[PDB]
Amino acid sequence: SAGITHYIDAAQITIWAFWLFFFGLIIYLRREDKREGYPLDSDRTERSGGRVKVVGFPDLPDPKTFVLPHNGGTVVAPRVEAPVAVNATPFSPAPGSPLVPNGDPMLSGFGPAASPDRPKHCDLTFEGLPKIVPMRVAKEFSIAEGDPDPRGMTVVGLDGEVAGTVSDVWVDRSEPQIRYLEVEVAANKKKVLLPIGFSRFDKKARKVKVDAIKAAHFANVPTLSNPDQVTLYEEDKVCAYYAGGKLYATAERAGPLL
Amino acid sequence: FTMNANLYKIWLILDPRRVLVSIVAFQIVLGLLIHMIVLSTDLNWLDDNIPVSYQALGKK
Amino acid sequence: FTMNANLYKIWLILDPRRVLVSIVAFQIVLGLLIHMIVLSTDLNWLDDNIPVSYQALGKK
Amino acid sequence: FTMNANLYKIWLILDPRRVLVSIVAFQIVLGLLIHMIVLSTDLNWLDDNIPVSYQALGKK
Amino acid sequence: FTMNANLYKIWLILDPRRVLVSIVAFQIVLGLLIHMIVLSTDLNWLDDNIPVSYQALGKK
Amino acid sequence: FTMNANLYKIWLILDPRRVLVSIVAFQIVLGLLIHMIVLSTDLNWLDDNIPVSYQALGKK
Amino acid sequence: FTMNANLYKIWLILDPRRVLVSIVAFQIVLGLLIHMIVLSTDLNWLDDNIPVSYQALGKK
Amino acid sequence: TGLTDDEAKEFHAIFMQSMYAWFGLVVIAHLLAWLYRPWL
Amino acid sequence: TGLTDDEAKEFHAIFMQSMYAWFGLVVIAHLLAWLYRPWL
Amino acid sequence: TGLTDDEAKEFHAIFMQSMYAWFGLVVIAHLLAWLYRPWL
Amino acid sequence: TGLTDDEAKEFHAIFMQSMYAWFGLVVIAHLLAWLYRPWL
Amino acid sequence: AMLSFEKKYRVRGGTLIGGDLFDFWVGPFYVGFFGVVGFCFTLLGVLLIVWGATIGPTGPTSDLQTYNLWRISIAPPDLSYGLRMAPLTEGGLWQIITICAAGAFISWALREVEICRKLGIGFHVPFAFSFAIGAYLVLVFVRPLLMGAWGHGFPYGILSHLDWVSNVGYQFLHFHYNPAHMLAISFFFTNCLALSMHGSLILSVTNPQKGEPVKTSEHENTFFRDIVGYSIGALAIHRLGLFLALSAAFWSAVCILISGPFWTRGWPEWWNWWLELPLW
């Protein structure tokens, strides 16, 4: 008998092996996925006083340690993070309801204005010099031939009003580029950072538009504990404020449209 | 049982936890592979009609 | 269900707004679904020529 | 006391302007749908030749 | 068993709400599903022509 | 069939500019939709030619 | 033997709240699985025409 | 939801009038449709 | 979960009766459906 | 589960009769279905 | 872990009979299944 | 439930439509007015694919009816129907499921939009999503329209749609010669390359050899500069990858848009314009 066709061929079983390796892969990737934000926030946890820490399937992976270079530290993941109050109040007492920011929305530090507490230290070059520093601290840097020098352009907010003028340019000493625009504010001549991401140029006019906030809001830009360098804490703090204006800076960004 | 004697010192070099799990995996796998090798050869024992054919227990 | 007089207490458990929207959507789609299923079978009520032929009220 | 005497109270749970907008949207969508559904069966009123065939009013 | 319980303690273990919503969603799903399973077999109740054939009840 | 008209108040709740363009857009789209529906059906005016189909003005 | 000296404390190692859910889901999934598997072979219990064929043997 | 119990009688009053107006308009269209072309 | 034990008293009544109304129109519609066209 | 020993008696109390309600309508529909059209 | 030694006795006890309640429903159904429809 | 840092952002407002009406969360998903339209479109779409599977091409009792996942398939109407709505059980169903799919993808896109407005992030993602929505539309709306009939659309079935691709592909004899096809394929392959390179990099620096600390930007640039004399840099690599994948989708959309409506001959024949230039 030389014809007993087997119903099982290498192609079936290779498709079997694959799916098994697959499932293990998926599972694993979802585990690396819980090295942050976990366990979750329910009132399942609060109701039970915490006896239901929310982690789901799969579960959380044993911590991993990152050894920052330069006497920098050591970070772990997953970690235990201290809760932080919410600077807002429930739009409804029902769960899943959004919260309204407390007080003046741009000040709230809630919503598009919220942000975490990153180190109060500076990111560093390879050598260990403050990575992000101004061109005034980073002597070498230079505009690229054929690019308007931002230095001296007028910074202008979302409504038209002048905001200030570019007093300097902050650069990456690691990957040479403009990261932050410095702004001598008109209303008080204080110096603030302006993330490049929020800034549009109008080279033919030497203006630097900013849809984010109004010219006035530039007065409240979060500040630097040193005008010649900036910490991780301070960057988030700077940007999130402008970001808040995307939903706050006007009595209309709140939406609807209809 | 090394078989003599300072070949224990090998676990002074290669993490015992890692070596163990490694072997567990390697075997748990190899078993599946060779099983499949046997399933496609003369040593196959399932789609053989051994010792009496089962799809000819009725018709299909 | 909750049919033991204390079946109001269910709303300390299930949010009225969210449950409301769910009921609404589920009902609307359910309606559309069942409608097309019936329109898709012999119980069709459109493709019957009711009560007198309409494609012989224009074509040929 | 019966009901339909405190059912205005519904706008204390559902914001009135938006409820209007949603209703209108549903009306537009349901409208096009139903039209297409009717057009999808024999009661169709366009590819019917009313009152005289137009696809044969382009050759004779 | 003539045994409707032992200990009702389960709601000290499983969130009453979660089980609630789950039962509702899954049941609605099982319902639609099985409905579909039955409509696809001989046990069909729509395309049966019940109680007398309808597409051959009028002109065609 | 109640008593309050005064339905001008509608623009105190609904933004006029956006409503304006919304109707504008919807009207152009509904326009295209309808045009494509009739042109694809019997009431067609293009795939005909009056008083004679024009590419059958010459066969050659 | 095979007598299990202490299968309590098993809930001191494995969080029970989890364990139940584990079992429930696993059983519903396995249930559907086996159901469909039996549905796909000869052991089918739906498409049998019980007790009289319903299509074209069912009054109509 | 920024309404009083009295600003929910009013909106409701005009809403009801308008919706019934719409449904009415609909019943009219359904009569023309029914006269020229009964569907049952 | 937004409500008190007393407001979960209020919501529930209107909820139950309107759901019953819906069910009424539906069952009614079904009896109507049954006369003009028996399906079972 | 942040509920008391009394409201897990209660929840259980109303829940069981409820599931029993569902089961009732279920057995109803299934016997009626077996009567009109046997499947096994 | 997050139980006392007394409530895993309590939990296990309730658990086993509950499980067997399930096994019972199953062997019963399989008995039914085996009677109407023997498979081997 | 929320991430351990989520509550602080779960602000009110940002809609386009609905306002506080549907301005809430469910589990981790954001609802919004478009989540509701989306869920409705989606649910009816799927529930109808279930009914199509239920009925089969010749009726629920025929042998072509099936619930097997590889083979369930819902196909368009014949070409004889043109752009008209065709009877339900003759491809009508497929048309409605399509309307639902287009509406669901568009709702999904608009809901990602409200989510950008809430979180205050750029709207690069739903714009990028819109490229897939576009490709889907050419494959069901644009091409079959330009082609005077909706039947030119692909059927919705796992392998049967593969068959559609196959025979449509083969009407042009050797599809590989479609030049836009050549582009799109180039991007799909290169995209897959940069992604493997970025992926590899991030993971190679944040987790270096034991005995080494998280690596640096300087390392990053130095490695790919070491290997290939160039490093596009961190920001931009994220920019490129977005370019490649969106373009890959683009050229797929154009390569199929021209296969019919603007070209009917075999595709290798297209390359004739090159052998006939007055240079040779």
Add this chain to the structure above:
Amino acid sequence: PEYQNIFTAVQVRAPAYPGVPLPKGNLPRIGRPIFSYWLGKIGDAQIGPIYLGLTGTLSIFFGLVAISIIGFNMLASVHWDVFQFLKHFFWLGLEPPPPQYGLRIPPLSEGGWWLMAGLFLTLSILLWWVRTYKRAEALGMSQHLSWAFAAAIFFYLVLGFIRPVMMGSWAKAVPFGIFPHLDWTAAFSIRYGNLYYNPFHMLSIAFLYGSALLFAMHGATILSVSRFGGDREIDQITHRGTAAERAALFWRWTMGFNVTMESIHRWAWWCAVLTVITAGIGILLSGTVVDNWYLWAVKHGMAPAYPEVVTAVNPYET
């Protein structure tokens, strides 16, 4: 309105960077940098220096040899008419040894240039492999690239060398030409009864589509959180910022779950390596194990049936 971080609108220069320093043994670096205002318009404007060791030189060497055999051969097929070479270039190619020869080393005029170009190409690709492992070690980094390159090398090897040796015939490897290698692809599917029904080729296709999906999604994300320096992924990985937060949340609120700044790079990594690895497996079973995939799909009941509305009588059966 808002900058999109598509085009660097205002650049800055600084003296070029020779890079982090390599240990003893790792040779000097060569070439001295330049800047392209235009690369700069979209990315790091710095061009080079480059590293070249024994490895790098032996790889550039083999690789260029292989490029010459293929090219010179193509000029020969048009009679040394560089014009004609230019005209039909796309269609030119260097075909493989004929089957008549099996796996024997063939005469120059009958395929031997292909075996030599195939040989030299492979050695040069695998030398570039070693190159990236060396360049990756000099930096203390890990071999994640090398595990991927090794996967793509896997597919390559399966295509032109492994399957051929297994099938006992150099004529089964792919020929070097644009249009020629496209044709090789189509003929390959045809010869084995339509490759669409090959499960592995379906998976490889899900994974290619997935590399486009993930990189487009992630990439769009990083740009949308570019405003918060999300591009600076390394520190968002060590020290989570509102970029990584807004990022994880956009997706969380959208599709119900999410990843992290570190993990997305693993989903993406694993998705790419998977393409090539299903892909190679896919070519491995063709002819070695399965000869007609459509039939295979029928045997496993996966091919759909359609009402047979058009059919043709079999002359072979008359």
